[PDB]
């Protein structure tokens, strides 16, 4: 009765009664084939946007292959010439002014095209992040086929809840449909558990596939899956070299995405910014 707790005293629940359970779950293993109509994504039906977006190249083919994972008389002469010179100048200014309006309208269409390609790239990245989570989910379904359907699992709370009996799997659209049979604990005994016990302060023991439960102020052993206290023997314990606990701290890992450097906009632009103030010539 000189057994002493090793590792502390913890109140935990040990099953005392069970019922047969049937859990039915779907696990996704694939996705529909997804491609992007980049012209329809960015422009819709607007023909000016699509016409300007043609000049952006075949990036949709590249995106979609990523998604699918494959003295007086002379004055009259001067008046005649001035009419032609001013006719050619006025005509030239119109051609200049028409090309300036075209450039400004195309620049504004480019900005909305470019902004909607940033939204497009965010969606392609989201599609790629979902298809990665589907691949993670497809691996979880294959682990349950191997360990729940093609065999019986000793893992508790893996093929549903409780202790595995038998599993069935059926094809379902974009995944697999599992039917699990278990006996699940419906009632628990809140028991006083020590991780190990020290004998006489010299020799420590650990419960072999079970718990050390203090019942009626004496330390007894019970199986972990069912509350049935029983005397501590050599068949249900493991001998520890010492009854001192070896404490360990696993590394602390938190995913924190780092913000990019991205220098000041004006300072970076000033390396090449040609801000000119063009001045028209003075013509008499």
Binders of its own copies among 234-273, rule CB under 8 A?
238-250, 252-255, 257-266, 268-269, 272-273
**Token digits of residue 67:** 């998604």
| Residue matched to tokens 């300072």 | 267
Closest CA to 51 of 64, 37, 39, 61: 39
Contact positions with its own copies (CB under 8 A) in 7-66 = 7, 10, 12, 17-26, 28, 31, 34, 41-44, 46, 49, 52, 54-59, 61-63, 65-66
> Is 106 in contact with 52 (CB distance < 8 Å)?
yes
Closest CA to 223 of 235, 239, 207: 207
Which of 6, 14, 42, 141 touches other proteins (CB under 8 A)? 42
For residues 3 and 83, what is the distance between their CA atoms, to the nearest angstrom?
119
Q: Using CB under 8 A as the criterion, what x/- string covers residues 1-20 for binding other proteins?
A: --------------------
- Is the CB of 61 or the CB of 101 nearer to other proteins? 61
Residue 274 binds to other proteins (criterion: CB under 8 A): no
> Is 188 in contact with 15 (CB distance < 8 Å)?
yes
Residue 174 binds to other proteins (criterion: CB under 8 A): yes
Report, in Å, the least distance between residue 114 CB and other proteins. 16
Parallel/antiparallel/unpaired status of strands 237-240 and 218-223: unpaired
Q: Is 104 helix (H, G, I), strand (E, B) or coil?
A: helix
Which of 4, 206, 214, 215 touches its own copies (CB under 8 A)? 206
Which of 37, 68, 97, 218 touches its own copies (CB under 8 A)? 97
> Is 210 in contact with 224 (CB distance < 8 Å)?
yes
Parallel/antiparallel/unpaired status of strands 218-223 and 163-172: unpaired
Report, in Å, the least distance between residue 280 CB and its own copies. 4
Report, in Å, the least distance between residue 218 CB and its own copies. 20
Which H or E element spans position 188?
Answer: strand 175-194
Residue 189 binds to its own copies (criterion: CB under 8 A): no
Contact positions with other proteins (CB under 8 A) in 67-96 = 67-68, 70
Report, in Å, the least distance between residue 39 CB and other proteins. 4
Q: Residue 176 phi/psi, 5° resolution?
A: -135, 140
Binding interface with other proteins (CB under 8 A): 30, 32-45, 50, 53-54, 60-61, 64-65, 67-68, 70, 123, 171, 173-174, 259-262
């Amino acid at each position: 009765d000189s057994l002493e707790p090793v590792g502390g005293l913890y109140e935990i629940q040990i099953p005392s009664e069970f019922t047969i359970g049937n859990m039915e779950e779907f696990i996704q293993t694939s996705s529909p084939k997804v491609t992007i109509d980049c012209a329809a994504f960015v422009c819709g039906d607007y023909a000016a946007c699509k016409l300007q977006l043609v000049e952006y190249g075949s990036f949709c083919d590249n995106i979609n292959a990523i998604l699918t994972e494959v003295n007086a008389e002379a004055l009259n002469n001067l008046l005649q010439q001035l009419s032609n010179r001013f006719g050619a100048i006025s005509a030239s200014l119109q051609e200049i002014l028409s090309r300036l309006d075209a450039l400004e309208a195309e620049a504004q269409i480019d900005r909305l095209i470019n902004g909607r390609l940033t939204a497009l790239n965010a969606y392609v990245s989201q599609q790629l992040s979902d298809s990665t989570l589907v691949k993670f989910s497809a691996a979880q379904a294959m682990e349950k086929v191997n360990e729940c359907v093609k065999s019986q699992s000793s893992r508790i709370n893996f093929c549903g809840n409780g202790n595995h009996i038998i599993s069935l799997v059926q094809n379902a659209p974009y995944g697999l449909y599992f039917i699990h049979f278990n006996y699940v604990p419906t009632k628990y005994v809140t028991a006083k558990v020590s991780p190990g016990l020290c004998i006489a302060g010299n020799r420590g023991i650990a419960p072999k596939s079970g718990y050390f439960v203090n019942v009626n102020n004496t330390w007894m052993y019970t199986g972990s899956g069912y509350y049935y206290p029983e005397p501590i023997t050599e068949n249900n314990v493991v001998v520890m070299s010492t009854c001192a606990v070896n404490y360990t701290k696993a590394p602390y890992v938190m995913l924190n995405t780092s913000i990019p450097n991205l220098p000041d906009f004006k300072e970076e632009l000033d390396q090449w910014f040609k801000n000119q103030t063009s001045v028209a010539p003075d013509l008499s």
